[PDB]
Amino acid sequence: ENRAQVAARQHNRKIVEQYMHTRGEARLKRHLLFTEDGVGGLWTTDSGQPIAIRGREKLGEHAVWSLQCFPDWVWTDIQIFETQDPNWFWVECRGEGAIVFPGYPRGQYRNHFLHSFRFENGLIKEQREFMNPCEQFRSLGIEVPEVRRDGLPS
Amino acid sequence: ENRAQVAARQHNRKIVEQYMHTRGEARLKRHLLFTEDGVGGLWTTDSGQPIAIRGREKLGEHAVWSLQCFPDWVWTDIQIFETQDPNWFWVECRGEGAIVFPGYPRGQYRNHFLHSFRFENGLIKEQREFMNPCEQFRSLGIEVPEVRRDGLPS
Ligand SMILES: O=C(c1ccc(O)cc1)c1c(-c2ccc(O)cc2)sc2cc(O)ccc12
Ligand SMILES: O=C(c1ccc(O)cc1)c1c(-c2ccc(O)cc2)sc2cc(O)ccc12
């Protein structure tokens, strides 16, 4: 049991490292790090519902879009956390790049991120990214509402 | 070395458990789970800067406020992750309760959270919570902006 868990954790860590360092044209093949039915996407959005991309085929299609709308994206300040589950990792990092969304002015987007990676048989079964959407709003020129703080201790 | 790390991780996990299960009036003593100079707070806000509460005395004062403004708050769906660092844990959970913020209508707030816990000498040195502020906006009746999706693949 321990031997199998140690082997899984060490292999899965290398896949997380590879995913987090993938940039440029290599993004077009990042979906090969997933199971055929693997899921990826953004869990923190304006609607409160995740934008989940389901299946290795749709993940590869999404990468094409990502190359147009986040053309130079880089993950920085990467810290990878193994867990007691050899098949579950967390990553704390930052990300940065141009944001080129349809019908918005071109912007520069910087944010802090957390990623969750769950594995099955050596590949990613579920990737999820979590951020503060207010920073993406700012990068797009969208007004961010402000909670009134007058009544709060400061 | 291994023995010291295992002991630290086992003790620190009990403190994370205790923190996540602290409810009601016991919140008034939750700051005793921190070092004297410990820091806690909310890393995801409308401004993009953390609201960090610095020092055990200020943490204790914030709990008084928390009891009025989140009077029945509970953390649910708690999943605690140990890491390769015996002094660093992550928690995935949900939270819910009434929200009674000054100058806003009383509401109901539900959100998904990630917590980071870093330890020093058996107590919490740094706690950070991460959420999607859009859900807190909704709970307060604040309009949430919407990214236009027409040009995005759906
Ligand atoms: O930035 C993204 C994003 C990034 C990565 C990902 O895995 C999924 C979504 C957002 C959107 C989007 C939807 C469909 C697409 O085809 C492309 C983009 S809509 C939206 C709305 C937000 O409030 C914040 C982010 C995004
Ligand atoms: O809900 C919180 C909060 C909760 C826990 C915590 O540890 C720190 C802040 C928010 C605020 C706040 C500031 C000072 C206080 O004295 C009390 C509250 S301002 C604000 C603004 C937001 O966009 C979202 C949440 C909050």
XYZ file of C-alpha atoms and ligand atoms in Angstrom:
360
model
C 0.000 0.000 0.000
C 2.642 2.542 1.012
C 4.776 1.681 -2.027
C 1.858 2.280 -4.377
C 0.916 5.555 -2.688
C 4.472 6.904 -2.723
C 4.874 6.042 -6.426
C 1.583 7.718 -7.293
C 2.418 10.896 -5.390
C 5.846 11.247 -7.013
C 4.482 10.767 -10.542
C 1.479 13.032 -9.952
C 3.735 15.794 -8.633
C 5.646 15.776 -11.929
C 2.387 16.204 -13.872
C 1.387 19.188 -11.654
C 4.804 20.748 -12.249
C 4.464 20.209 -15.982
C 0.960 21.709 -16.044
C 1.988 24.803 -14.080
C 5.015 25.427 -16.330
C 3.087 24.973 -19.597
C 2.967 28.155 -21.641
C 2.980 29.424 -25.174
C 2.268 26.942 -27.907
C 2.701 24.003 -25.499
C -0.733 24.922 -24.130
C -2.183 23.289 -27.247
C -1.136 19.889 -25.848
C -1.854 20.480 -22.127
C -5.086 18.473 -22.438
C -2.957 15.343 -22.864
C -2.253 15.622 -19.102
C -5.925 14.749 -18.435
C -7.930 11.527 -18.460
C -10.281 11.141 -21.447
C -13.199 12.277 -19.240
C -11.129 14.778 -17.272
C -12.553 18.157 -16.263
C -10.837 21.529 -15.942
C -11.903 25.123 -15.537
C -12.604 28.184 -13.439
C -14.579 27.738 -10.224
C -14.891 31.452 -9.276
C -16.912 33.595 -11.661
C -19.360 36.485 -11.628
C -22.339 34.149 -11.801
C -21.296 31.977 -8.877
C -21.298 28.877 -11.057
C -18.099 27.189 -12.283
C -17.125 27.294 -15.949
C -16.249 23.616 -16.264
C -14.702 22.214 -19.434
C -15.653 18.522 -19.682
C -13.614 15.960 -21.522
C -10.162 15.865 -23.000
C -11.549 16.877 -26.428
C -13.307 20.015 -25.145
C -10.218 20.806 -23.053
C -8.096 20.791 -26.208
C -10.637 22.996 -27.963
C -10.616 25.442 -25.019
C -6.829 25.779 -25.283
C -7.220 27.234 -28.772
C -9.441 29.946 -27.345
C -7.039 30.504 -24.418
C -4.225 31.213 -26.888
C -6.248 34.074 -28.421
C -7.672 35.640 -25.261
C -4.746 35.055 -22.842
C -1.999 35.014 -25.491
C 1.053 35.257 -23.196
C -0.205 33.852 -19.884
C 2.378 32.779 -17.282
C 1.928 31.165 -13.883
C 4.479 32.567 -11.398
C 5.358 32.108 -7.696
C 4.365 28.463 -7.872
C 4.119 26.526 -4.612
C 2.966 22.925 -4.932
C 1.381 21.156 -1.959
C 1.218 17.403 -1.759
C -1.442 16.055 0.583
C -2.246 12.896 2.511
C -4.133 11.792 -0.616
C -1.438 10.847 -3.176
C -3.952 11.715 -5.887
C -4.798 15.268 -4.627
C -2.565 18.318 -4.877
C -3.077 22.035 -4.264
C -1.078 24.856 -5.834
C -0.782 28.455 -4.672
C 0.532 30.799 -7.364
C 0.076 34.032 -9.260
C -0.727 34.487 -12.933
C -0.208 37.313 -15.364
C -0.693 38.239 -18.982
C -2.561 40.280 -21.527
C -6.337 39.802 -21.497
C -7.930 40.086 -24.915
C -11.632 39.393 -24.378
C -14.136 39.869 -27.191
C -15.651 43.336 -27.104
C -13.498 44.625 -24.230
C -10.418 46.850 -24.446
C -7.155 44.929 -24.383
C -5.886 44.845 -20.806
C -3.209 43.457 -18.518
C -4.482 40.908 -15.985
C -2.693 39.928 -12.779
C -4.188 37.743 -10.067
C -3.544 35.336 -7.206
C -4.716 31.777 -7.764
C -5.300 28.487 -6.019
C -5.487 25.299 -8.082
C -6.848 21.875 -7.101
C -5.564 18.802 -9.006
C -7.144 15.367 -8.546
C -5.619 12.360 -10.326
C -6.744 8.993 -11.647
C -4.291 6.416 -13.057
C -1.502 8.901 -13.609
C -3.415 11.752 -15.256
C -5.566 14.688 -14.151
C -9.222 13.774 -13.548
C -10.204 17.204 -12.186
C -8.447 20.562 -12.291
C -10.095 23.594 -10.676
C -8.793 27.162 -10.402
C -9.963 29.712 -7.825
C -9.328 33.459 -7.845
C -10.911 36.765 -6.918
C -12.991 37.778 -9.973
C -12.811 41.455 -8.922
C -9.252 41.598 -10.285
C -10.429 40.232 -13.634
C -13.204 42.844 -13.685
C -10.571 45.564 -13.177
C -8.432 44.185 -16.024
C -11.482 44.438 -18.340
C -12.443 47.971 -17.274
C -15.554 46.726 -15.479
C -16.542 48.736 -12.371
C -16.168 46.743 -9.141
C -18.749 47.495 -6.432
C -17.461 48.524 -3.066
C -18.820 47.236 0.213
C -19.380 50.278 2.436
C -16.985 50.016 5.401
C -18.055 52.975 7.517
C -19.862 50.838 10.061
C -17.105 48.261 10.320
C -14.289 48.459 12.859
C -11.088 49.815 11.331
C 13.701 14.774 12.249
C 10.905 12.578 10.926
C 9.600 12.009 14.467
C 9.478 15.758 15.158
C 7.700 16.417 11.869
C 5.115 13.688 12.405
C 4.363 14.977 15.919
C 4.017 18.556 14.690
C 1.683 17.559 11.875
C -0.538 15.494 14.180
C -0.842 18.285 16.753
C -1.357 20.983 14.142
C -4.123 18.967 12.489
C -6.011 18.920 15.820
C -5.761 22.727 15.998
C -7.120 23.081 12.421
C -9.992 20.759 13.352
C -10.703 22.791 16.465
C -10.637 26.061 14.506
C -13.008 24.799 11.820
C -15.471 23.515 14.423
C -15.470 26.631 16.597
C -19.037 27.995 16.629
C -21.230 30.270 18.685
C -19.844 31.823 21.836
C -16.679 29.701 21.551
C -15.645 32.050 18.749
C -14.812 34.527 21.506
C -11.841 32.315 22.477
C -10.716 31.244 18.993
C -7.861 33.742 19.054
C -6.167 31.550 21.690
C -5.396 29.148 18.817
C -3.001 31.780 17.423
C 0.487 32.890 18.369
C 0.673 36.268 20.131
C 1.653 37.887 16.800
C -0.599 35.650 14.716
C -2.479 37.005 11.706
C -5.886 36.000 10.359
C -8.345 37.388 7.870
C -9.889 37.572 4.440
C -7.591 37.551 1.423
C -10.248 38.057 -1.289
C -12.131 41.363 -1.147
C -13.609 43.935 -3.504
C -10.484 46.123 -3.249
C -8.037 43.374 -4.129
C -6.163 43.851 -0.873
C -6.419 41.468 2.092
C -8.203 42.443 5.291
C -5.597 41.148 7.720
C -6.228 41.154 11.459
C -2.840 41.358 13.179
C -2.122 40.050 16.629
C -3.970 37.905 19.108
C -5.538 40.930 20.841
C -6.999 42.343 17.581
C -8.132 38.844 16.570
C -10.083 38.642 19.823
C -11.697 42.023 19.151
C -12.669 40.945 15.607
C -14.439 37.902 17.048
C -16.746 40.227 19.004
C -17.699 41.908 15.742
C -18.091 38.512 13.988
C -20.615 37.373 16.605
C -22.876 40.326 15.759
C -22.489 40.367 11.980
C -22.335 36.583 11.362
C -24.352 35.474 14.400
C -24.971 31.810 13.423
C -22.060 31.110 11.078
C -21.009 27.540 10.434
C -18.336 25.928 8.303
C -19.603 22.813 6.503
C -18.269 20.165 4.070
C -14.900 20.434 5.808
C -11.956 18.719 4.099
C -8.567 19.174 5.776
C -5.382 18.705 3.731
C -2.052 18.025 5.364
C 0.961 18.899 3.233
C 4.635 17.991 3.002
C 5.193 20.938 5.377
C 4.048 19.761 8.840
C 3.314 23.406 9.657
C 1.108 24.157 6.608
C -2.448 22.943 6.046
C -5.176 23.776 3.534
C -8.920 23.410 4.105
C -11.679 23.267 1.498
C -15.148 23.915 2.891
C -18.367 25.827 2.563
C -19.739 28.357 5.019
C -23.162 29.759 5.669
C -25.194 31.937 7.971
C -27.110 35.132 8.407
C -25.220 38.267 7.346
C -25.978 41.385 9.419
C -23.671 44.024 8.016
C -23.961 47.637 9.118
C -26.189 49.628 6.798
C -27.242 46.689 4.620
C -30.453 44.643 4.796
C -30.182 41.460 6.828
C -29.455 38.584 4.505
C -28.360 34.987 4.104
C -24.783 34.352 2.963
C -23.464 31.082 1.553
C -20.061 30.606 -0.060
C -17.265 28.194 -0.909
C -14.003 28.775 0.915
C -10.362 27.755 0.949
C -8.356 28.323 4.119
C -4.574 28.354 4.563
C -3.154 27.616 8.046
C 0.553 28.106 8.831
C 1.837 27.101 12.285
C 4.653 28.086 14.632
C 5.359 26.244 17.892
C 1.968 24.544 17.974
C -0.300 27.535 17.279
C -1.546 29.360 14.186
C 0.903 31.995 12.907
C -1.114 32.833 9.765
C -4.676 32.009 8.752
C -5.992 33.211 5.364
C -9.412 32.669 3.836
C -10.177 32.813 0.115
C -13.634 33.050 -1.458
C -15.513 34.542 -4.401
C -16.625 38.034 -3.212
C -19.439 38.068 -5.798
C -21.429 35.748 -3.519
C -21.000 38.134 -0.585
C -22.139 40.993 -2.835
C -25.304 39.009 -3.646
C -25.974 38.332 0.066
C -25.836 42.112 0.695
C -28.058 43.000 -2.268
C -25.145 44.584 -4.142
C -25.354 44.270 -7.938
C -22.670 41.981 -9.370
C -21.276 42.975 -12.787
C -21.508 40.475 -15.571
C -18.772 39.735 -18.059
C -20.382 39.730 -21.513
C -20.083 36.198 -22.911
C -21.470 36.572 -26.425
C -18.086 36.389 -28.046
C -16.869 33.548 -25.846
C -17.250 29.906 -26.880
C -20.265 28.329 -25.211
O -11.777 33.946 -17.802
C -12.639 33.087 -17.988
C -12.266 31.649 -17.952
C -10.917 31.301 -17.837
C -10.530 29.968 -17.767
C -11.488 28.967 -17.800
O -11.109 27.670 -17.683
C -12.831 29.303 -17.916
C -13.216 30.634 -17.979
C -14.072 33.511 -18.077
C -15.011 33.225 -19.042
C -14.957 32.322 -20.218
C -16.052 31.534 -20.555
C -16.046 30.771 -21.707
C -14.933 30.762 -22.530
O -14.929 30.007 -23.665
C -13.827 31.532 -22.195
C -13.847 32.312 -21.048
S -16.543 33.996 -18.715
C -15.925 34.706 -17.261
C -16.652 35.474 -16.370
C -16.032 35.914 -15.216
O -16.758 36.639 -14.313
C -14.712 35.604 -14.965
C -14.007 34.817 -15.858
C -14.589 34.372 -17.023
O -16.656 40.191 5.460
C -15.621 40.824 5.650
C -14.547 40.226 6.484
C -14.794 38.997 7.092
C -13.802 38.349 7.812
C -12.542 38.919 7.929
O -11.570 38.251 8.613
C -12.286 40.144 7.330
C -13.280 40.783 6.603
C -15.434 42.129 4.990
C -15.115 43.347 5.566
C -14.764 43.720 6.956
C -13.762 44.656 7.198
C -13.479 45.077 8.482
C -14.172 44.547 9.557
O -13.952 45.041 10.807
C -15.160 43.594 9.330
C -15.458 43.194 8.035
S -15.006 44.613 4.379
C -15.386 43.518 3.100
C -15.406 43.831 1.747
C -15.657 42.822 0.840
O -15.655 43.081 -0.498
C -15.900 41.528 1.270
C -15.888 41.232 2.623
C -15.612 42.216 3.556
